[PDB]
Amino acid sequence: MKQYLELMQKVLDEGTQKNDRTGTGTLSIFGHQMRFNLQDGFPLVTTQRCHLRSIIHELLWFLQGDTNIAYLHENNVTIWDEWADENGDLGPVYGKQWRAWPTPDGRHIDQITTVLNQLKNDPDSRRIIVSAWNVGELDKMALAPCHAFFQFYVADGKLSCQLYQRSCDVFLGLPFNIASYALLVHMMAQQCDLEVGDFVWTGGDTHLYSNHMDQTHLQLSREPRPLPKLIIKRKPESIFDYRFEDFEIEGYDPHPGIKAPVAI
Amino acid sequence: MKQYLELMQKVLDEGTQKNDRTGTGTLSIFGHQMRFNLQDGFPLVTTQRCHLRSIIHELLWFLQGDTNIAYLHENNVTIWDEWADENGDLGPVYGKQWRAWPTPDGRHIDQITTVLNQLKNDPDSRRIIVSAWNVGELDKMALAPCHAFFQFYVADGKLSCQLYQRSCDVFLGLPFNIASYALLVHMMAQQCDLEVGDFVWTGGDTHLYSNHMDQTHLQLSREPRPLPKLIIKRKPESIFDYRFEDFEIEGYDPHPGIKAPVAI
Numbered sequence A, B: 001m002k003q004y005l006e007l008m009q010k011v012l013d014e015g016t017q018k019n020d021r022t023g024t025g026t027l028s029i030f031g032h033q034m035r036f037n038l039q040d041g042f043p044l045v046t047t048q049r050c051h052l053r054s055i056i057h058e059l060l061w062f063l064q065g066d067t068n069i070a071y072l073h074e075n076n077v078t079i080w081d082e083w084a085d086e087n088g089d090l091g092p093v094y095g096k097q098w099r100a101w102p103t104p105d106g107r108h109i110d111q112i113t114t115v116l117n118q119l120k121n122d123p124d125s126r127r128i129i130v131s132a133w134n135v136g137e138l139d140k141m142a143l144a145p146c147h148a149f150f151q152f153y154v155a156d157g158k159l160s161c162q163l164y165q166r167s168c169d170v171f172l173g174l175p176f177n178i179a180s181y182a183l184l185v186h187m188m189a190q191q192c193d194l195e196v197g198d199f200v201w202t203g204g205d206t207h208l209y210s211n212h213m214d215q216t217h218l219q220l221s222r223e224p225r226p227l228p229k230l231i232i233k234r235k236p237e238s239i240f241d242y243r244f245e246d247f248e249i250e251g252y253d254p255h256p257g258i259k260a261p262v263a264i
Ligand SMILES: O=c1ccn([C@H]2C[C@H](O)[C@@H](COP(=O)(O)O)O2)c(=O)[nH]1
Pocket: A021, A144, A146, A147, A167, A168, A169, A170, A172, A173, A174, A177, B126, B127
């Protein structure tokens, strides 16, 4: 995508050498923002083939408030294997904070339902927020939330959403983080009878790993193709009733996939 | 300031009519980001006189973990009077979340000290974050945090900071939110022996109230003056030991102040 490739070029031209936790260096910039008008089409990177299958199951899993990978395994989705323990537990990550944020007084807060209530009853609210940054449970999580905080907004019958991502691997992580939240905006809007608006991506430490230089130059030489269109085949009774097969992406014609290896 | 006036013009040209909770309409945009190189000077609006006295005491108060306005009153700072109850309590707002985020297991998390520890021991960390968005305590707060979440970043000996502000009154709130966090970046950097870098402001619902149109046009006709320089007179033993008199702003020559009335 145009916005995506411009970011890639910006990290190359303006990034500072910065080390990560494993010791692999990165080229990093701090603070960036991109906007995607969802009416122009589904924001799925075309300059390299992205497989949506995993994204969709992962999102459905988050909505379930599930933090054990069993559901992912029944569908042979292995993207969280790296972090799970022998029982397949990840600790109180995303889904748990979204659906059951624990309070000091013994309650569990359903932020997803809270957000739906606000979108239907008080759409002008400037506090329609979901946060996975639960300070008191950070130590128990396999990993600290990257996509930590997001806010919804309604104006003229259009649902917009801004995500704050504290850390971002532009090559390997970003394509998937964008498609994931754009998808959630489409589900949310369908359930609230609103049109889709903008998905605003805001990043903190936005970077490219130094061992991904050839892959980046290769993708930077490719030309963006038309964006696909997302179609939701049915309208479930609630946000927790979607199923994998309800979604179809039409018109997605990507350039070949590029492999990016990681150090251990 | 240039970035500030450009935002003001953008809300006028691109904002959508949106109602707020009191019923006063606003012109609103969603998602905006500005960057301030703190080495270029202290980001205090010059196209209208801003009084830093209140900003400074409020910040010192936040750092104390104090949520009762008594300290503000001893210094005749009344900016929180509107929200306090008869005892002068605001509930678990900013200072309490910053210094004593309560966990379900009975602990109180000092996010400010946590952040200092990381800046000194693990400066490359991509998780140096402070959040006031404590979902479990929102109902008890006089008001939901506007400046909800911020992240620090170190690269080449420079301390940068990005604030996520969910809601923003460009005329009345913004000048003060910027100066407040820029000040905190200077204190933080002094305590960690780092140079100051960039303060990145990211906003959610960014707006101007409709009864502030004349004031906005008046400020938009003024020319930005040189930015002042902040000087910190001494180096306290810790981040909790600053005092009002440690700060001096030099070279601040603002245009006259503009009053903006609010509906009740
Ligand atoms: O959804 C995700 C999850 C992780 N990352 C990246 C950012 C980093 O390169 C790494 C996490 O490192 P820490 O940031 O946490 O340290 O993975 C993403 O880009 N997106």
